Design a protein around this ligand. Structure first.
Ligand SMILES: *[C@@H]1C=C(CO)[C@H](O)[C@H](O)[C@H]1F
Ligand SMILES: [Mg+2]
Ligand SMILES: [Mg+2]
Ligand SMILES: [Mg+2]
Length: 532
């Protein structure tokens, strides 16, 4: 009976409970509008050529929590009316949007959008990409089918519209419904461990690795994970460089030392220089019959594997099978968005359908006993496949006090996303807030910043992985980690999720330290923690 709800349109008609049919020239939608706890659900099926299918239209709120489709992109509150299109980096187009025609004109939010007291959220992204655009003062929900044709009906991605003054509660409920819809993997045990990247970056040597592997026996690390550095090229995962042994030999040394071997790949990415690409130029997504650049990194054009091709999926299966055989049981799989870039594939399936085949192949290959950590990944499409997911831009050994909020590395913005995507944790997957950087030297992080970052992550019950030259972690670093792990185990809530001043009140019930509250200020870099 609300005046806002009378103002809503669903598939172009007025919002009310029922079963409905939209027949147009090019497509047919059959949908149901059902009442559910705390709002409404729209579900059904579509066939024909739905293209960019308008699902919902309502008046655009002034302040919206918007969400980028992938790990690194911002989840933040913006003013819907004063939006100006960003300059899009030609090297990273698709991190910004899978539909960049939208974002060069209009405010875009992927999967969900919130305002004070309301959540609009799609429960899945299996076939279509679900997004919202603010178009001349209206919020419009779309399902993008990328010009794919369906002879027979396929399921819509369901949409929920939830309403209640407790917006955090709504986001948590939304995420519960996503997790149900996609059979989310929420492991009962969270791995601790070590990651090479945020100290050594691409300059990691096996020599330095071995030093840290020895020191790691003194730290509470289960996993020891080799990051980007070991591989000869992007796509040539089983060929090492420099002073590294074979990929199999690395696993055996790590295992011999009593750790779970972890390894980094970018499994949907092949560089223009790689052996795999040069051997198989028809394995990639194309544009005008020619390889289409998915992004530019490592000073190379990087192409996307065409995950509609059986030869490609077999290759992935064989790769990850091989790695599992060697003893790897922790897989950090990066730049996953590449697999979902728009373009020409062998089969006329959506980039999301392709993406899902790819990640499902990896899951099958590594088995149920392996931990998969997603990163640089579309979020909804991965639910049910990954165990953990990076939900923020990279951290860094500096705060980023005047670094722009554009998805680039900075502790300040990594932590912001850990806070604003908190509700995904223990519902979609385990949230990975990125590594703690606790070293005393070779850092521009202050002790107070280290504390703020680490204690926040602990209160949020998020994955705790450390990334340091362990030689440089002394009493202060060890204490911060110890105290962090004491804050795990709870059910967190960010009580003021629509905050625009980067000050957040965060509670967590039932931690190893009881009920806890941390108030954090990411501008002033202050926290105040109460443990009861
Ligand atoms: C993806 C990329 C790298 C290094 O190339 C790191 O592993 C980062 O944490 C990931 F998001
Ligand atoms: Mg109207
Ligand atoms: Mg076909
Ligand atoms: Mg938990």
């Amino acid at each position: 009976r609300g005046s806002h709800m009378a103002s809503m349109e669903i598939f172009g008609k007025t919002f009310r409970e029922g079963r409905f049919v939209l027949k147009e020239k090019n497509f047919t939608v059959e949908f149901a509008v059902e009442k559910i706890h705390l709002g409404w659900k729209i579900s059904g099926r579509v066939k024909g050529s739905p293209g960019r299918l308008e699902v919902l239209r309502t008046k655009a709120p002034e302040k919206v929590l918007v969400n980028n489709w992938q790990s690194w992109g911002p989840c933040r509150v913006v003013d819907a009316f004063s939006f100006k299109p960003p300059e899009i980096d030609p090297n990273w187009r698709y991190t910004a949007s899978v539909v960049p025609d939208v974002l060069e004109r209009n405010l875009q939010s992927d999967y969900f959008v919130a305002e004070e007291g309301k959540v609009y959220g799609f429960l899945s992204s299996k076939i279509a990409h679900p997004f919202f655009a603010v178009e001349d003062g209206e919020l419009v929900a779309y399902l993008e089918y990328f010009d794919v044709e369906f002879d027979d009906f396929v399921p819509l991605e369901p949409l929920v519209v939830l309403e209640d003054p407790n917006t955090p509660l709504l986001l948590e409920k939304y995420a519960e419904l996503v997790g149900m819809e996609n059979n989310a993997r929420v492991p009962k045990h969270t791995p601790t461990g070590w990651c090479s990247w945020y100290h050594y970056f691409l300059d990691l040597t096996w020599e330095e690795t071995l030093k840290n592997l020895k020191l790691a026996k003194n730290f509470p690390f289960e996993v020891f994970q080799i990051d980007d550095a070991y591989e000869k090229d992007i796509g040539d995962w089983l060929v090492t460089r420099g002073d590294f042994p074979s990929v199999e030999e690395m696993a055996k040394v790590i295992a011999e030392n009593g750790f779970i071997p972890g390894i980094w790949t970018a499994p949907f990415s092949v560089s223009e220089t790689s052996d795999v690409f040069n051997e198989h130029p028809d394995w990639v997504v194309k544009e005008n019959g020619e390889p289409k650049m998915a992004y530019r990194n490592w000073n190379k054009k990087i192409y996307a594997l065409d995950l509609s091709k059986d030869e490609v999926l077999n290759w992935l299966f064989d790769l990850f099978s091989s790695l599992r055989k060697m003893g790897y049981r922790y897989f950090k799989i990066d730049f996953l968005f590449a697999g979902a870039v728009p373009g020409e594939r062998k089969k006329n399936i959506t980039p999301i359908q392709a993406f899902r085949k790819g990640i499902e192949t990896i899951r099958k290959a590594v088995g149920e006993d392996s931990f998969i950590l997603g990163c640089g990944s579309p979020l909804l499409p991965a639910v049910g496949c990954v165990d953990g997911m990076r939900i923020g831009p990279d951290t860094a050994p500096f705060w980023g006090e005047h670094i722009e909020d554009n998805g680039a590395p900075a502790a300040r913005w990594a932590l912001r996303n850990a806070i604003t995507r908190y509700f995904m944790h223990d519902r979609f997957w385990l949230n990975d807030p990125d590594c703690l950087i606790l070293r005393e030297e070779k850092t521009d992080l202050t002790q107070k910043e280290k504390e703020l970052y680490s204690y926040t992550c602990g209160v949020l019950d998020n994955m705790i992985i450390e990334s340091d030259d362990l030689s440089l972690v002394r009493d202060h670093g060890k204490k911060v980690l110890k105290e962090t792990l004491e804050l795990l185990g709870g059910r967190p809530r960010v009580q003021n999720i629509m905050s625009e001043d980067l000050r957040y009140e965060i509670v967590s019930s039932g931690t190893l330290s009881g009920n806890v509250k941390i108030v954090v200020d990411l501008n002033s870099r202050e926290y105040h923690l109460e443990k009861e």
